[PDB]
Symmetry: D2
Subunit: 27 residues, 4 copies
């Protein structure tokens, strides 16, 4: 199941992308 999240702001997107990528690797 794939979901899209709309993120406002460049830095906010980069933070949430990093967290997403981290969780993908760690889970």
């Amino acid at each position: 199941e794939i979901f899209t999240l709309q993120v406002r702001g460049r830095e906010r997107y980069e933070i949430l992308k990093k967290l997403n990528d981290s969780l993908e690797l760690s889970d």
Copy 2:
């Protein structure tokens, strides 16, 4: 208020989406970053 720019993040799995949505919603309200 806040940034005018918008970017789509793809998330795999409901649990992970819920965590990230919670953070995203928090940041929209607080505007910390």
Copy 3:
């Protein structure tokens, strides 16, 4: 008072991210 917990965070940028999230959640909660 709300009880204080600590996390040891490795790296300045990692710390800065988690601090911003902490502060955001304090404000939105």
Copy 4:
């Protein structure tokens, strides 16, 4: 470089701990 993050309350602590633990395993940042 280790930074100590202070967090108020269990709910925020557990979210941030999950993230910190993930980041330690992945080293994304």
